[PDB]
Design a protein around this nucleic acid. Structure first.
Lengths: 430, 435
DNA sequence: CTGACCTCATCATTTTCTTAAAAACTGACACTTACAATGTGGTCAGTT
DNA sequence: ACTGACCACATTGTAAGTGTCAGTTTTTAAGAAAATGATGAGGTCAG
């Protein structure tokens, strides 16, 4: 349109430099007559010119020029089963929670989180895992990484962190960028080496009391009490609790969280919420002791929330009624059936493939007694359009001589387990 | 036996309390299965299950073909934010259709996460929209996504280093100083005239990265001329380890004179990084954002943070991709622009009558206006009187480190006030004041 | 030999799951009004 | 005489609105089947 055509035509002229600074623009009220355009279009074009500072106008009209110069299957514990997700149950609550009548939920607020969401999480934790909490005690954010970065900023750059050697490669990745340094630790079949911790001047150590990734070892009560006494020995040491994959134990009901024994408020409860409902929904949560929570509130008062308020409201409406328990039970049953079927199928190769670990969880890890190296196993698996993930990446120490490979089955359909196992074993040469 | 918890639980609790109180010592022999089952008239299965759970917990240890052994030794009416958007005008009925379209039973294999840099789609449509609406020239793979501006700025801070010195605008939007208060880096305060940032103070100082808004200046609304933009670009080009960050506040809400092209459009030496937002246009509570980086910084970010995961859910990403794929975003933006223009004209016409004691500083474009109060009363008195009428207001003192003008000037917002309540709110706040 | 490891049988209560009809929803097509964009024309007050 | 901005009413094409409709969908008191905790009676193997 001429509204912008004239503006561009004069902009290219002022840019190329046929007119210098101080020269008047060709005319006013005369260029419209000479170019047979109306005066309004010229006025609008000149207003556009002076808006961006290409030409500046004296309050009495003068014009001053300015410019002058392909995998069939995959196996790993991250995936969860997606077919059995009740979409028709999520959609109902979504349509119930977001309506034109219920406005003013489109604007941000409650930097920590929605009060109802926090209260319901506290109630659920207290009545399920035996974790004493307070509605204002718990904080909620998107992703565990953000919460751990907030923790790192809150504690400082003058601390050393304890990480078990075979475990989840997350704290190492976070501490690589930060100035802090970590100390490796070995683990036996009963838990972490509490003796090594107590004979060392570590400050904060990271562990999963409920289930040990990936071996599934469960800490006994004597080691737990010894660790609490070690934390009580000093005044400025803290223990972080990781709620990786609880509520998924079949035979032996559920084991209470370590915080239940925390009489002297010295445990912070890290958790997770995206390894149950949706892997890509990005909600996590964390509980802190009263003094540390108070200091965090008094220190991080400016940051806004990280997870959308719509998701908070729809999910607290979803699991306020009680569908969370039903979905959890159905997932537990189907995963138990999958585990039993996989174990029964793989039991016949007991002489060469020995299963090690415990039933509870979403994955199993098996040692291969064949003479091929772990690289050969991975290459042959990926050559059959079914890639597998070795355990060597989960520990930074020297490679274990028997090639130990982790296997997951969350993503594999129930009817394709036999075919996947058969083709994997055929690729391995059995 | 009458409790809802089966004997599978009462027996375990009883042995729990017996062990904890110390009635059974270390290594003491348990009565095994048959003896206890006969003594307590309970089936072998429940007793063996309770003992197996006990062994799993670790209180006692079982050895094959022999008995157990213990191993346990001991009110506001009209809120005034220059940050809200109008809520009633939001087309919820259009959001619902896309949400029901994207999340269905057949739409499996999407709950699992992935593509930490964002799905190729959302990136490609956001790049297309940026190129065709703001003159931003960038390949789709360069843009990144995140939950809000805070996470992106923290990632940029970690990627750059702890030695750089950051430059901010005049006393104003208090974000970068709040972020840098927790980091070893330091900020250099600056001053701006009624046109923009003073490039002379930039070139007489050795600052490395300076934060500015080349489109609209918070809160004065000043727009940088081409000469100052070219001078800043030349200063950035002068050295080899200095960068300029661009933050477009409301660059798509210019009423009369179309849209002002972005500063990145004039960049040729790959020296600017774009910082946009999706929380001041569509919904201020979904927490979406984006950032554009040049090729070397893109490679550095890809090779440095390759082992992260996006903080934005794929449901929202896909529904936004569907929303902006068919063009409803432009229609919604036009509707919001028109309603905000009408609101601004109405409020300006209403406030024109009281002009002797009050003045308007900001320009037409934007969502807020700043006005001075020449009445003989201090800023705290204005704030307290406003709050006493159940409608509190926000002064510029919080935005100002120093004291600029002795007559207090207050920022007023109208994004979250209905058209039928503007006159009533203005009348009641004026009555609360001396007028 | 008594003693402790196990794996079938089939009983039971109470949650989960499935199909029927009757209910409300909303989609595409259509059309009737409206509406604010650019745009031409004719002014307006005030400088110097 | 040279030049500020402020009406008039003309235009094309996007946005807004009501209509009935076929259509995918929501809701429900039945129905039946699954699973656990539970009793009973075995199985091998040590020492």
């Amino acid at each position: 349109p001429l509204y912008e055509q004239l503006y561009a035509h004069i902009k290219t002229e002022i840019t190329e430099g046929r007119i210098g600074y101080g020269t008047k623009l060709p005319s006013k009220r005369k260029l419209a007559d000479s170019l047979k355009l109306s005066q309004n279009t010229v006025e609008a074009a000149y207003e556009q010119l002076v808006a961006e500072g290409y030409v500046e106008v004296i309050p009495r009209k003068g014009f001053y020029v300015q410019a002058y110069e392909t995998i069939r299957y995959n196996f790993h514990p991250t995936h969860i089963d997606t077919t059995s997700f009740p979409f028709e149950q999520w959609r109902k609550y979504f349509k119930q929670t977001m309506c034109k009548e219920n406005h003013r939920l489109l604007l941000n607020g409650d930097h920590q989180g929605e009060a109802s969401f926090r209260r319901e999480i506290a109630y659920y934790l207290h009545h399920s895992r035996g974790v004493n909490c307070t509605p204002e005690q718990v904080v909620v954010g998107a992703g565990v990484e953000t919460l751990l970065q907030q923790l790192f900023l809150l504690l400082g750059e003058s601390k050393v962190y304890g990480i078990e050697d075979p475990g989840y490669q997350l704290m190492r990745k976070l501490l690589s960028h930060y100035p802090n340094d970590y100390v490796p630790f070995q683990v036996d079949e009963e838990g972490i080496d509490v003796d090594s911790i107590v004979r060392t001047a570590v400050d904060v150590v990271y562990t999963t009391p409920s289930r040990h990734f990936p071996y599934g070892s469960v800490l006994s009560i004597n080691r737990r009490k010894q660790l609490l006494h070690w934390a009580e020995a000093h005044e400025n040491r803290y223990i972080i609790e990781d709620d990786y994959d609880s509520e998924f134990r079949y035979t032996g009901k559920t084991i209470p969280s370590l915080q239940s024994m925390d009489v002297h408020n010295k445990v912070i409860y890290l958790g997770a919420f995206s390894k149950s409902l949706i892997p890509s929904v990005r909600i996590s949560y964390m509980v802190l002791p009263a003094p540390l929570a108070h200091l965090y509130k008094n220190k991080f008062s400016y940051y806004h929330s990280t997870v959308s308020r719509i998701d908070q409201q729809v999910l607290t409406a979803f699991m306020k009624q009680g569908d969370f328990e039903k979905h959890l039970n159905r997932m537990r049953k189907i995963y138990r059936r999958k585990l039993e079927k996989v174990l029964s199928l793989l039991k016949r190769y007991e002489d060469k493939l020995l299963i090690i670990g415990e039933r509870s969880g979403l994955h199993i890890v098996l040692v291969v007694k064949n003479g091929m190296d772990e690289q050969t196993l991975v290459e042959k698996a990926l050559a059959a359009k079914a890639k597998v993930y070795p355990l060597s990446a989960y520990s930074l120490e020297r490679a274990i001589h028997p090639p130990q490979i982790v296997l997951g089955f969350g993503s594999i359909p129930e009817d394709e387990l036999e075919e996947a196992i058969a083709t994997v074993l055929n690729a391995w040469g059995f």
